[PDB]
Amino acid sequence: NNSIAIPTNFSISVTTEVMPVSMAKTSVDCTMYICGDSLECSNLLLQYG
Amino acid sequence: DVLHLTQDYFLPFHSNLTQYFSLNIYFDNPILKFGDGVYFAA
Numbered sequence: 345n346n347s348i349a350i351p352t353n354f355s356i357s358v359t360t361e362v363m364p365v366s367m368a369k370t371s372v373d374c375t376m377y378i379c380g381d382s383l384e385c386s387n388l389l390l391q392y393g
Numbered sequence: 394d395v396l397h398l399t400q401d402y403f404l405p406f407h408s409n410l411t412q413y414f415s416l417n418i419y420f421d422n423p424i425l426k427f428g429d430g431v432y433f434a435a
């Protein structure tokens with residue numbers, strides 16, 4: 345109840361922190377993945393248009 | 394009231410048709426080609 349600790353010297357410390365910000369941007373083509381260069385398959389894809 | 398997309402035979406836009414005349418000063422009607430369809434404008 346009558347004791348206290350007080351510092352007598354200091355130090356300067358440089359730390360690092362790594363933060364993600366953005367990721368890769370992607371695009372997908374409906375044709376050339378579902379029906380690749382097929383006229384019979386692309387004639388049926390319009391019903392899922 | 395629909396924006397439906399077809400896939401059939403059509404005349405392509407900005408295509409080059411042939412011109413056949415019938416002037417007097419001639420009379421030509423050659424055997425033309427009928428493929429999947431013919432556009433005829435006289």
Ligand SMILES: *[C@@H]1O[C@H](CO)[C@@H](O[C@@H]2O[C@H](CO)[C@@H](O)[C@H](O)[C@H]2NC(C)=O)[C@H](O)[C@H]1NC(C)=O
Pocket residue numbers: 352353354
């Ligand atoms: C606090 O600590 C630093 C070291 O981190 C002390 O600096 C040293 O001081 C002595 C003399 O007291 C020099 O001979 C040294 O070159 C200094 N540097 C190092 C890296 O040892 C400093 O004196 C301390 N302060 C206090 C005890 O009040």
Ligand SMILES: *[C@@H]1O[C@H](CO)[C@@H](O)[C@H](O)[C@H]1NC(C)=O
Pocket residue numbers: 407408409
């Ligand atoms: C125009 O006619 C030419 C022949 O002169 C043809 O090769 C071409 O496909 C036609 N159309 C266009 C848009 O150039």
